[PDB]
Scaffold this active site. Structure first.
Site, mmCIF file in Angstrom:
data_model
loop_
_atom_site.group_PDB
_atom_site.id
_atom_site.type_symbol
_atom_site.label_atom_id
_atom_site.label_comp_id
_atom_site.label_asym_id
_atom_site.label_seq_id
_atom_site.Cartn_x
_atom_site.Cartn_y
_atom_site.Cartn_z
ATOM 1 N N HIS A 41 -7.773 146.523 -8.045
ATOM 2 C CA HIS A 41 -8.776 145.836 -8.918
ATOM 3 C C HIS A 41 -9.031 146.496 -10.192
ATOM 4 O O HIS A 41 -9.920 145.838 -10.885
ATOM 5 C CB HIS A 41 -10.227 145.695 -7.962
ATOM 6 C CG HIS A 41 -11.054 146.909 -7.893
ATOM 7 N ND1 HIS A 41 -10.826 147.650 -6.580
ATOM 8 C CD2 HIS A 41 -11.595 147.840 -8.475
ATOM 9 C CE1 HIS A 41 -11.530 148.791 -6.728
ATOM 10 N NE2 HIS A 41 -11.995 148.905 -7.774
ATOM 11 N N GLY A 143 -17.001 154.236 -10.665
ATOM 12 C CA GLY A 143 -16.116 155.002 -11.162
ATOM 13 C C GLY A 143 -15.263 155.764 -10.202
ATOM 14 O O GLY A 143 -14.422 156.667 -10.610
ATOM 15 N N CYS A 145 -13.682 154.758 -7.320
ATOM 16 C CA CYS A 145 -12.194 154.093 -6.830
ATOM 17 C C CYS A 145 -11.142 154.741 -7.172
ATOM 18 O O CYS A 145 -10.781 155.327 -8.159
ATOM 19 C CB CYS A 145 -12.472 152.901 -7.040
ATOM 20 S SG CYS A 145 -13.787 151.849 -6.289
HETATM 21 C C1 LIG Z 1 -15.204 151.473 -7.605
HETATM 22 C C2 LIG Z 1 -14.636 150.996 -8.641
HETATM 23 C C3 LIG Z 1 -14.236 152.004 -9.858
HETATM 24 O O1 LIG Z 1 -14.354 152.912 -9.784
HETATM 25 C C4 LIG Z 1 -13.935 151.251 -11.168
HETATM 26 C C5 LIG Z 1 -14.312 150.012 -11.430
HETATM 27 C C6 LIG Z 1 -13.089 149.639 -11.404
HETATM 28 C C7 LIG Z 1 -16.008 151.159 -7.198
HETATM 29 C C8 LIG Z 1 -17.215 151.927 -5.792
HETATM 30 C C9 LIG Z 1 -18.566 151.792 -5.428
HETATM 31 C C10 LIG Z 1 -19.558 151.759 -6.406
HETATM 32 C C11 LIG Z 1 -20.927 152.239 -5.899
HETATM 33 N N1 LIG Z 1 -20.269 152.885 -4.623
HETATM 34 C C12 LIG Z 1 -19.062 152.605 -4.332
HETATM 35 O O2 LIG Z 1 -18.519 153.003 -3.369
HETATM 36 N N2 LIG Z 1 -15.945 149.845 -6.357
HETATM 37 C C13 LIG Z 1 -16.472 148.441 -6.705
HETATM 38 O O3 LIG Z 1 -17.417 148.345 -7.320
HETATM 39 C C14 LIG Z 1 -16.143 147.369 -5.392
HETATM 40 C C15 LIG Z 1 -15.134 146.418 -6.079
HETATM 41 C C16 LIG Z 1 -14.422 145.420 -5.480
HETATM 42 C C17 LIG Z 1 -13.650 144.439 -6.790
HETATM 43 C C18 LIG Z 1 -13.279 145.820 -4.648
HETATM 44 N N3 LIG Z 1 -17.569 146.662 -5.268
HETATM 45 C C19 LIG Z 1 -18.397 147.309 -4.190
HETATM 46 O O4 LIG Z 1 -18.083 148.538 -3.791
HETATM 47 C C20 LIG Z 1 -19.329 146.331 -4.304
HETATM 48 N N4 LIG Z 1 -19.314 145.911 -2.815
HETATM 49 C C21 LIG Z 1 -19.271 144.721 -2.168
HETATM 50 O O5 LIG Z 1 -19.278 143.801 -3.169
HETATM 51 O O6 LIG Z 1 -19.181 144.206 -1.089
HETATM 52 C C22 LIG Z 1 -19.139 142.814 -0.568
HETATM 53 C C23 LIG Z 1 -20.460 142.119 -0.554
HETATM 54 C C24 LIG Z 1 -21.642 142.643 0.206
HETATM 55 C C25 LIG Z 1 -22.960 141.825 0.260
HETATM 56 C C26 LIG Z 1 -23.338 141.032 -0.792
HETATM 57 C C27 LIG Z 1 -22.127 140.487 -1.751
HETATM 58 C C28 LIG Z 1 -20.767 141.322 -1.833
HETATM 59 C C29 LIG Z 1 -20.847 146.971 -4.518
HETATM 60 C C30 LIG Z 1 -20.883 147.538 -5.746
HETATM 61 O O7 LIG Z 1 -22.123 146.328 -4.583
HETATM 62 C C31 LIG Z 1 -23.132 146.459 -3.480
HETATM 63 C C32 LIG Z 1 -24.208 145.463 -3.994
HETATM 64 C C33 LIG Z 1 -22.728 145.919 -1.869
HETATM 65 C C34 LIG Z 1 -23.151 147.822 -3.237
#
Ligand SMILES: *[C@@H](CC(=O)C1CC1)[C@H](C[C@@H]1CCNC1=O)NC(=O)[C@H](CC(C)C)NC(=O)[C@@H](NC(=O)OCc1ccccc1)[C@@H](C)OC(C)(C)C
Ligand SMILES: *[C@@H](CC(=O)C1CC1)[C@H](C[C@@H]1CCNC1=O)NC(=O)[C@H](CC(C)C)NC(=O)[C@@H](NC(=O)OCc1ccccc1)[C@@H](C)OC(C)(C)C
Lengths: 306, 306
Positions: A41, A143, A145
């Site tokens: 991603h 940040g 990931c």
């Molecule tokens: C890492 C990404 C990076 O470091 C840089 C941007 C490239 C992060 C880590 C998250 C941040 C907060 N704690 C963590 O471990 N990764 C992401 O932001 C994820 C990106 C995707 C493209 C894989 N997104 C999440 O981790 C995101 N989760 C998610 O959307 O899950 C599915 C979902 C569930 C319920 C409703 C809608 C969707 C997180 C940010 O969002 C929350 C709202 C669920 C926490």
């Protein structure tokens, strides 16, 4: 003598962490020999994260679309490909700090050390267990990931996890180092939820053996149980069923302490039914399930305090 | 987002660990520049440990009485001296992996990472708090002396502890890197006991702020308290008295969450008086006191989940 949630020394892994940028998206990567591995991603802008078609997003990138930084040194990418949910970036330099290593897919219940990283820079280390529902209870912010989980045996690093996302309950999901997710999760921001979890019975038993090795026997009793009668109690308290393989695994701990596995199970059944009565085990007021039988042998004395 | 007891990455410290042998006694040492630091009891045979006169034991040794091994490389000692409870061995080679560093004497309540080592080889890392009674609840076996505790700021390692002994209750004692013990302990096997301990109030408050930053407010209430009325409750539950300096330290956390310190104290008083009612805070069923206000800021998001 003590018992702590102990991570492996992280030095061999710190020397492998780098920063990977694509456009304005930046995360961490793992540099081994001449390849840098990172979550795919990194090719997404924030608007691509809801329903990315990665094959379509990636074909639009070139090798120079990727900026890889190891400390203050830029690494030129000379090739790239997608492997499941990771990108493999071939770079022009082989990492001189590459440790002996292998990639392993860990099983539910097993533990590993996580080296939390931001902007290619290691910030902290802690031990996690892979939960039965395939998530980990980590501590990660924006940040993080590309941070990895690993175990070290002799001087060989077995990498087993790369971090990709957080779920609504605050727990975390990611992949092995071949890019395959642990669990039914996908690297997209469509709604997902962790399934129901369960307590890792094998680990709770291992930790009770650790408490006896360290000198405490208060929770033992004069009873025994059959596997089946124990499982009727486990089902009620949301513990994984105990299996004969689990009893066999506990053989060395049982031998070091002279306590038969099913007798330790009878002790656990009584703790589940009666509580701890305001007492502690290895300093805890609850039954701990994030230490495997291997973690207990690694950390405790090979001589029980009789 | 999670909250874990997180240690600092240990790489910069792993490169400093060596093995030190005198006769048949072996433990770990810390090699910085051209000096190796280690517990002075390495000069004792088991029979000297009850009532050693170190000055008399050391005058009987020469530089070659000491064997120092860094990996598979022997380091020749060209000088030695005693500084409080440590020996400082000057060696013929300067450690090429020496990190930027300083020696600091940590205060009660503060935390640090311990790199447990055996035979000069790092085996695990975990976070410890210096208890009010000057002991730490570590995890150490025979051969672990000379293991060190430290904090890392930017790329500077502040060493603050070197391990020397275990007390009857299973807790641990040691010295700063000038060889002065934390606490009233002495490096001799005459009977000693840790004094009574207390819960670190400042840290418990910091951890409640961490729980609010991460999105949980269930334990708050509509009350406030004065410092004095709070301290009457603290005395009853064996918590350290809260001081105005402690209230001032909590200022940034209070500002990030919009909860006045004395209002958070009123929440803590209610948790002490009523219990948690079967609920958890940051996954815990008890009030955690091994995270300092600095540890919370280091690990949590700078944006509260409102
Ligand atoms: C890492 C990404 C990076 O470091 C840089 C941007 C490239 C992060 C880590 C998250 C941040 C907060 N704690 C963590 O471990 N990764 C992401 O932001 C994820 C990106 C995707 C493209 C894989 N997104 C999440 O981790 C995101 N989760 C998610 O959307 O899950 C599915 C979902 C569930 C319920 C409703 C809608 C969707 C997180 C940010 O969002 C929350 C709202 C669920 C926490
Ligand atoms: C390190 C020493 C080395 O690694 C190598 C030998 C040089 C260890 C660490 C201990 C081992 C178990 N867990 C640890 O942390 N150090 C020592 O063995 C100590 C040596 C002295 C010369 C400083 N001894 C202890 O830690 C010793 N404690 C002790 O004697 O305390 C005072 C005392 C209290 C009550 C009764 C009598 C004396 C330990 C081994 O003994 C027990 C019985 C208290 C655990």
């Amino acid at each position: 003598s003590g018992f702590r949630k102990m991570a492996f020394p992280s030095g061999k892994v710190e020397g492998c962490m780098v920063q990977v940028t694509c456009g304005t998206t930046t995360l961490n990567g793992l540099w081994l020999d001449d390849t840098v591995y990172c979550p795919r991603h990194v090719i997404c802008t924030a608007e691509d994260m809801l329903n990315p078609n990665y094959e379509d997003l990636l074909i639009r990138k070139s090798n120079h679309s990727f900026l890889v930084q190891a400390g203050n040194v830029q690494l030129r990418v000379i090739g790239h490909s997608m492997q499941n949910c990771l990108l493999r970036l071939k770079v022009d330099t082989s990492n001189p700090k590459t440790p002996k290593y292998k990639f392993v897919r860990i099983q539910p219940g097993q533990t590993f050390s996580v080296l939390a990283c931001y902007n290619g820079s290691p910030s902290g280390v802690y031990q996690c267990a892979m939960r039965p529902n395939h998530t980990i209870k980590g501590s990660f912010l924006n940040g993080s990931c590309g941070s990895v989980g690993f175990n070290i045996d002799y001087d060989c690093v077995s990498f087993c996890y790369m971090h990709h996302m957080e779920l609504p309950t605050g727990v975390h999901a990611g992949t092995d180092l071949e890019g395959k997710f642990y669990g039914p999760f996908v690297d997209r921001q469509t709604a997902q939820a962790a399934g129901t979890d369960t307590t890792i019975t094998l680990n709770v038993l291992a930790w009770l053996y650790a408490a006896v090795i360290n000198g405490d026997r208060w929770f033992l009793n004069r009873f025994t149980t059959t596997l089946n009668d124990f499982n009727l109690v486990a089902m009620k308290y949301n513990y994984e069923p105990l299996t004969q393989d689990h009893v066999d695994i506990l053989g060395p701990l049982s031998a070091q302490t002279g306590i038969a596995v099913l007798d330790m199970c009878a002790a656990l059944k009584e703790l589940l039914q009666n509580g701890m009565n305001g007492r502690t085990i290895l300093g805890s007021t609850i039954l701990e399930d994030e230490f495997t039988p291997f973690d207990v042998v690694r950390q405790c004395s090979g001589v029980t305090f009789q």
